[PDB]
A paper describes a structure:
The diffraction data of XaxB was processed with the XDS package and SeMet atoms were determined using the CRANK2 pipeline in the CCP4 software package. Especially, helices αB and αC that protrude slightly from the five-helix-bundle take different positions. The highly conserved hydrophobic face of helix αF is oriented toward helices αD and αG and thereby shielded from the solvent. Interestingly, in the case of XaxB the tongue is formed by an amphipathic helix, while XaxA does not contain such motif. We identified two hinge regions that facilitate the swinging out movement of αF in XaxB.
They are composed of two subunits, namely XaxA (45 kDa) and XaxB (40 kDa) and are only active when the two components act together. Xenorhabdolysins, which were suggested to be binary toxins, perforate the membranes of erythrocytes, insect granulocytes and phagocytes and induce apoptosis. In contrast to previous predictions, XaxAB is therefore not a typical binary toxin, but rather a bi-component α-PFT.
Author numbering: 14 to 350
The structure:
């Protein structure tokens, strides 16, 4: 049964990473993620240690003293010139040694099962953990909010364009007024249509100037709400600057909405990270379950051999196969480093 420890350790590490770099503000999810990352790191360390620790326990069984001794007992029992008292004594020695070997194998199975059981309990601590209920709905809510924020932003850009166009018209009027120094001719109030129309330059020049000045004045009065008859230059300049400040108000609003979009997108990223955490957890848990099943089958077969007696060679093949397997896993672990 081939197992990929590389994927297991890489999933553990990615889980830790994503927990470290998760940006979603939910306190519950943050706490749960921290807990699961700690459980996974504890499990990685405990697995490394369990592999390094288990091989000696099984190794002790193969080099059991009682086996060569049993052989020597049988050798002695091969002698015909022996008393039935001594024969039964040696027979009891052999049978007792078989009983001690079985007892020792059971003690080994208990120790091995305990070591594996601690890992199993940690795997259970990991699996039982639930990050959040129906996360996909949370992601849906977050993306819906992001869409709503963008849809509320777009009209702000359109309105900024309209006010900027109005500012352009107003400042055109101001700069052209100074260009022709009209302020000096009509210093008290803006010249009416007839007043400017009566004198100077060309009818195209006159008409262009009139349209520009009237456009500026109309926009200014509309912004300030006063009627056209006010005809004051100061009203024009005041409206210009006041509309510009309103544009700055729009900039403030837009910056706030952009910051909220930043938070929402950051959150969505965090949630995606949590989903990837769950996926990597699944990846890890699959390999862990495979190793657990391997070890349980091994323990069952070893219990079967304990129930049966002697049969040293097949037992050695079993234990050595398991040791080679453990060494394979340890080698796989060491390779990644």
């Amino acid at each position: 049964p081939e197992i990929n420890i590389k994927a297991m350790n890489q999933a553990v590490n990615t889980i830790w990473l994503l927990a470290q770099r998760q940006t979603s503000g939910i306190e519950i999810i943050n706490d749960k993620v921290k807990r699961i990352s700690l459980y996974s790191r504890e499990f990685d360390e405990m697995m490394r240690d369990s592999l390094a620790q288990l091989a000696p326990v099984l190794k002790q069984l193969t080099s059991d003293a009682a086996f060569q001794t049993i052989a020597q007992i049988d050798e002695a029992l091969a002698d015909p010139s022996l008393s039935k008292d001594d024969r039964e004594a040696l027979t009891l020695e052999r049978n007792n040694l078989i009983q001690n070997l079985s007892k020792h194998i059971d003690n080994v199975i208990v120790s091995f099962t305990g070591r594996t059981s601690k890992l199993t309990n940690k795997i259970s601590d990991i699996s039982d953990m639930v990050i959040a209920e129906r996360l996909q709905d949370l992601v849906t809510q977050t993306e819906s909010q992001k869409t709503e924020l963008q849809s509320d932003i777009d009209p702000k850009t359109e309105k900024r364009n309209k006010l900027d166009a109005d500012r352009e018209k107003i400042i055109e009027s101001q700069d052209v007024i100074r260009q022709n120094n009209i302020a000096d001719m009509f210093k008290d109030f803006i010249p009416s249509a007839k007043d400017i129309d009566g004198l100077d330059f060309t009818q195209p020049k006159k008409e262009a100037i009139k349209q520009a000045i009237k456009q500026g004045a109309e926009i200014a009065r509309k912004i300030l709400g006063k009627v056209s008859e006010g005809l004051k230059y100061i009203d024009l300049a005041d409206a210009r600057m006041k509309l510009s400040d309103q544009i700055d108000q729009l900039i403030t609003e837009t910056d706030e909405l952009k910051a909220k979009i930043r938070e929402v997108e950051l959150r969505l990223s965090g949630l995606k990270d949590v989903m990837q955490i769950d996926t990597e957890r699944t990846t890890l848990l699959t390999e862990a379950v495979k190793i657990e099943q391997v070890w349980i089958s091994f323990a069952e077969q070893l219990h079967k051999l304990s129930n049966d007696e002697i049969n040293q060679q097949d037992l050695s093949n079993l234990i050595n196969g398991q040791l080679d397997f453990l060494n394979n896993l340890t080698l796989q672990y060491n390779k990644l480093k």
